[PDB]
Amino acid sequence: AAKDVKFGNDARVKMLRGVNVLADAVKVTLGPKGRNVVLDKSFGAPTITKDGVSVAREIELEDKFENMGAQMVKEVASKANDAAGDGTTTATVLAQAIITEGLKAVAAGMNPMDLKRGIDKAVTAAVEELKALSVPCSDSKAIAQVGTISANSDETVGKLIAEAMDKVGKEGVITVEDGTGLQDELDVVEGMQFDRGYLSPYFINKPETGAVELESPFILLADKKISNIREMLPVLEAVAKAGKPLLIIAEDVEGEALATLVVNTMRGIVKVAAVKAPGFGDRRKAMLQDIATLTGGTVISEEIGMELEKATLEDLGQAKRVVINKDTTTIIDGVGEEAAIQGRVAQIRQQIEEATSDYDREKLQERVAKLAGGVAVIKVGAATEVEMKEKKARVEDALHATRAAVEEGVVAGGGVALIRVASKLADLRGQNEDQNVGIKVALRAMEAPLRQIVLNCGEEPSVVANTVKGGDGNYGYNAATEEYGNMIDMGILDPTKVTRSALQYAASVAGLMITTECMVTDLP
Amino acid sequence: AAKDVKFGNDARVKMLRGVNVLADAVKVTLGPKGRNVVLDKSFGAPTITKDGVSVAREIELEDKFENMGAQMVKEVASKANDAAGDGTTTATVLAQAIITEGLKAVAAGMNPMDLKRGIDKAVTAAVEELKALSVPCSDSKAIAQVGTISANSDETVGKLIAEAMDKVGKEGVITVEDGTGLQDELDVVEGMQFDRGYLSPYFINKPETGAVELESPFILLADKKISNIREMLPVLEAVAKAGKPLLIIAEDVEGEALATLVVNTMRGIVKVAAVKAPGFGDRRKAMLQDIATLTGGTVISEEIGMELEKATLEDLGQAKRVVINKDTTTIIDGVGEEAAIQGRVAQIRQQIEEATSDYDREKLQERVAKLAGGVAVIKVGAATEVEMKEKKARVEDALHATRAAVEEGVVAGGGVALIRVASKLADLRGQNEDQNVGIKVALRAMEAPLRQIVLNCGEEPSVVANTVKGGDGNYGYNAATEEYGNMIDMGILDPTKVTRSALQYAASVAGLMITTECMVTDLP
Amino acid sequence: VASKANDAAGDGTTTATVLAQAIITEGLKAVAAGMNPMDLKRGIDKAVTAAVEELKALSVPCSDSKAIAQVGTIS
Amino acid sequence: RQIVLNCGEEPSVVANTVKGGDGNYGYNAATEEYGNMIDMGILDPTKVTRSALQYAASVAGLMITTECMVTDLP
Ligand SMILES: [Mg+2]
């Protein structure tokens, strides 16, 4: 495939437009008073939306290059959200702001390497400043606080989160299910969560969480790499007959059998999903054994001479629900009995006595944790189906912002925090007067979100911005009600994680681009 | 798929043309004196029609964008109809009226956010005003009144509706069947109706109601999610042999089995339809059981160990007719015996005594209602087949307007009611002089329909408009007979629901548009 | 405007321009709101005849050498 | 508002604080500080301030009452 190669300036100009199109389409939706974007949709009527993440997802441009620009900003703004629960649009908005001004600088004939340095300093410094502005959220009161605000003034959401954290801890694995009455319920139950994701996006059966949700599935617990679907066919037949879905948790599932199970749930013959096993090497086999104990399954270890050709249902583990992500598997209510589950904790307990190293310790206590610690399920109740799966949705929104608030606190939500931190470090210097521009570019980039919210509202940016800067702490402008005040008191807050992650992630891709010299791609 | 992105002004201009084309094709048919639109039809001779809903249906433009414009207005105007039984065209005609004027404003350099505010106030205000102009329709007299008017001066249609409501209540489920004599008949019969719709539009066998009509069908009452067509094949074989259609009322029917039954009624091998079960969670299983009792079917609950592989005809329920919509299922004359049906009411009756909550109460009485309350069937009689299925059509038209009148009353039909409410709130102000323009645009929009009817008739708008405005209450101009009078007395009325829905829905989409900043779509 | 400004006082031509660009912008915007432009004018004028009196009232004589130097300098 | 824009600060912030004062309070663009403009010796000759308003208005006025425009083919 012959390529089209672009250099230095051409490269960066293509890049820039690319990014502007992403940013102009996505940024107009930022406020509590964003504008609509109309997103055509093949058959039927277009979609009108104010949700940046929807707008983003659709942007792809004709000009490769331009496209590569826009795809790069998308990539990283999506990670911001990956790590924080939010900011995807903010990250994009800031990303433009740096790229634009930095990219002008390079083109004016200043030094890219220094502009990056400056920006990077300005970020480092403001991330600190954010830590300082940050108001902790630690007690049950504060937990319910950020939950209720994050779930839109609904006090009962705040409560339920507060209560869950209260039962399984601020770590504790907490999930949400569809509710069966009008009543909310909170139950702790045997289960577990581990940091492995689906092996193919095509397993997803609920694309709005971009996640897989299996009901009452059998669980295969194979300790080996699954390559051929041949090994599978006795188990997949017993499963298809019990009319239930199946989770594979093996070392891995590769090429053949993978692309097989994929096209097997594509046409919906047997719904299946597979994820790598937790951990690696020596502590893998122990950790797989744990999930066995949890779901009353049998581990199929090739190191004792058992093939998957010799496995009937009786071997498969079993749980009342399982939910997988991009990068998380969480098993809810495992049928494996307490006679066993406790007995295993008593085994692992003792392994901690015969620990002679510290790394061998935490690794055994993270295991005792996952296992005896449990998973807290919230059932969201409501009057009507619509209400319910809307409330359910907000419950997951808040749970997200709260887990976030716990870790790093909250700060002025309006754009405010970034406006603030930037007026604080407005002495900042570097050594090149090139790094100075770097720092300024970055600083003035940080106004972008506030200026944008205001703009969208149809008020004057410069004016609101200047008066937010005049103040201190979390004094800000609440675009929704047009009143200045203490943004936090007024219930307009972002987790610290999320404003930071936005900024860092914007800065990264902006540096990347200000230091790009070449761009390779396919021929038009 | 690379997109084509258009901003602010461009976007809006494209939208505007898009919406005009829809409106100018559609609006010439509005009056009792509309003009014809010719709608080409592939093989054979074209279609001449005066029916805005037909013209709309055909509108799709080449320029995406422009097309998006038209598609959005169609979307929303069709929901008006969805919620009221009429106004599809009016909603479009008002939609254009705001969009045109508000969109000129934005372009002139006034503030979108305020213009929307203004319009929305003017609407809010006139919706109230409408409630005031509204004359209730409550007693048997009034019911037959709006029925007869709505069925075109035919007093017998008014009667039959009046009589049905009179037997099963202004709520009670009332349907219409083809008549078998020259005589109309009214019968109440064991049956029921619940708020769930077809799972695929391809089930529709009578596209002019956009609805599915099955005759003497067996009913599968499965309590589970149906994924595989494997589970089905014994029951679909017994059903195909009895040469009768089949209704599935299971928790759901998914991907595989769904797209299967779909292509199974496409080539017409077995006519089938499936709809989700009523309600969710705990009260679902009870509610499914009720339909069982009603049709003497057996509920197949996986929670007792019964597969669909073990179900012969003897399990399927049975009713003399069933009709499904976009969003309604209604089961007419269930064979399930009165020994059982009454017994079930006596059971549920008692559950109300052992109610300790209010939500647990209404939920049990909505169940006693649906079941012992029954379904009232009108059979439309006539002399010839043509007459009959034309009369049958007007009977459903009136039934619609009546159900609607009941809920919110009737008002001056001629466009009048809007013309009136508008001349009432002609002081209205906002705060921006921008919002003022908003309110005016909106108000002056409200004349559109009257002006258009008059215009279609080939009389002078300005002049009839001015004289309708000079009057009060429901004095208006009856375009069909060119006489001013009391629109309601003269038999030219619109259910309150329908004039309001039309307005609100046109205002929504206009706001939406006046506040759209970006427009994404595929490349030409 | 710019030309006349200049035959009249040989200064302020940019301001003048700036003002007209401004009356016009705003005025046309109100013609699109559907005001009667002949009235827009009458108002603009009335506004102005008023503003001129106002100016003649703020004016204070410039008659020392210092002030004269300041107008020079600023010009 | 243009004086201020030409310095690359924000016209509506400057105009607002100027508007918030009295008599000859105004913004010294050169020194970027507020104060009394007479004392700072930032004097415009009245006859100019006045002619700029008069002439600008005189034509702008007519201009916004254009409804048709006649001219040559390109
Ligand atoms: Mg000068």
Curated annotation (Swiss-Prot), chain C:
The chain holds residues 77 to 151 of 548 of the full protein. It comes from the Bacteria. Disulfide bonds: none annotated. Each subunit is composed of an apical domain that binds non-folded proteins and GroES, an intermediate domain and an equatorial domain that binds ATP and is involved in inter-ring interactions. Forms a large central channel that appears to traverse the entire length of the cylinder with no obstruction. The central channel of GroEL functions as two cavities, one in each ring, that are separated from each other by the crystallographically disordered 23-amino-acid C-terminal segments of the seven subunits. The entry and exit of polypeptide seem to be restricted to the apical end of each ring. Modulating the volume of the GroEL central cavity affects folding speed in accordance with confinement theory. Small proteins fold more rapidly as the size of the cage is gradually reduced to a point where restriction in space slows folding dramatically. For larger proteins, either expanding or reducing cage volume decelerate folding. A stepwise reduction in cage size results in a gradual loss of cell viability. It comes from Escherichia coli (strain K12). Phosphorylated reversibly during heat shock. Together with its co-chaperonin GroES, plays an essential role in assisting protein folding. The GroEL-GroES system forms a nano-cage that allows encapsulation of the non-native substrate proteins and provides a physical environment optimized to promote and accelerate protein folding, probably by preventing aggregation and by entropically destabilizing folding intermediates. This is Chaperonin GroEL. The modification N6-acetyllysine is found at K41. The modification N6-succinyllysine is found at K41. ATP binds at D11, G12, T13, T14, T15.
Curated annotation (Swiss-Prot), chain D:
It is found in: Cytoplasm. Phosphorylated reversibly during heat shock. Changing E10K: Temperature-sensitive lethal mutant. At nonpermissive temperature, the rate of general translation is reduced and a defined group of cytoplasmic proteins are translated but fail to reach native form. Disulfide bonds: none annotated. ATP binds at N28, A29, A30, D44. Belongs to the chaperonin (HSP60) family. Together with its co-chaperonin GroES, plays an essential role in assisting protein folding. The GroEL-GroES system forms a nano-cage that allows encapsulation of the non-native substrate proteins and provides a physical environment optimized to promote and accelerate protein folding, probably by preventing aggregation and by entropically destabilizing folding intermediates. Also plays a role in coupling between replication of the F plasmid and cell division of the cell. Each subunit is composed of an apical domain that binds non-folded proteins and GroES, an intermediate domain and an equatorial domain that binds ATP and is involved in inter-ring interactions. Forms a large central channel that appears to traverse the entire length of the cylinder with no obstruction. The central channel of GroEL functions as two cavities, one in each ring, that are separated from each other by the crystallographically disordered 23-amino-acid C-terminal segments of the seven subunits. The entry and exit of polypeptide seem to be restricted to the apical end of each ring. Modulating the volume of the GroEL central cavity affects folding speed in accordance with confinement theory. Small proteins fold more rapidly as the size of the cage is gradually reduced to a point where restriction in space slows folding dramatically. For larger proteins, either expanding or reducing cage volume decelerate folding. A stepwise reduction in cage size results in a gradual loss of cell viability. Forms a cylinder of 14 subunits composed of two heptameric rings stacked back-to-back. Interacts with the co-chaperonin GroES. Can form asymmetrical complexes, composed of one GroEL and one GroES, and symmetrical complexes, formed between one GroEL and two GroES oligomers. The asymmetrical complex is the functional unit. It was suggested that the symmetric heterooligomer may represent a transient intermediate in the chaperonin protein folding cycle. This is Chaperonin GroEL. The chain holds residues 452 to 525 of 548 of the full protein.
